[PDB]
């Protein structure tokens, strides 16, 4: 019944990335917007736009580079059934730093690298590589 909207966002991105599409549209929220922005800063997507009119729609344009999609493995970590939190010393590494893990901290939603840069841990949302 959409008890996790972020998992729906990542599932939509993965499913339409596998299907060789160009734009993904979904209901938006101020958390999905932060996730989309942090992906944009990491070069995993082309662009994201938020619609107006009371029921905003968020649309994301994807990248392909070669014949294979740029995002090959995206996975949610902290679900509503588990709620995983980690400290600075325990922030997970995906592909030994070749990827990124999104972390929600009291300074906002950022990457694990920025998380150690500010020295603030938090909740591990998902891992992308």
């Amino acid at each position: 019944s959409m008890q996790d909207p972020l998992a729906d966002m990542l599932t939509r991105i993965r499913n339409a990335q596998m299907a060789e599409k160009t734009v993904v549209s979904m209901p938006s929220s101020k958390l999905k917007a932060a996730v989309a922005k942090v992906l944009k800063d990491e070069g995993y997507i082309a662009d994201f736009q938020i619609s107006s009119e009371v029921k905003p729609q968020l649309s994301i344009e994807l990248k392909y580079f070669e014949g294979k999609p740029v995002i090959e493995e995206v996975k949610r970590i902290s679900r509503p059934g588990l709620r995983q939190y980690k400290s600075v010393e325990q922030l997970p590494k995906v592909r030994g730093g070749l990827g990124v893990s999104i972390v929600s901290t009291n300074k906002g939603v950022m990457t694990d690298r920025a998380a150690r840069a500010a020295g603030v841990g938090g909740e591990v949302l998902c891992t992308v590589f």
């Binding site: 990491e42 070069g43 995993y44 990248k63 580079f65 740029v70 730093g97 070749l98 590589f129």
Partner: peptide
């Protein structure tokens, strides 16, 4: 690296 780093420059992806 330098292939997963095709999105942008180098020494920032790592």
């Amino acid at each position: 690296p330098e292939a997963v780093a095709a999105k942008r420059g180098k020494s920032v992806e790592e």
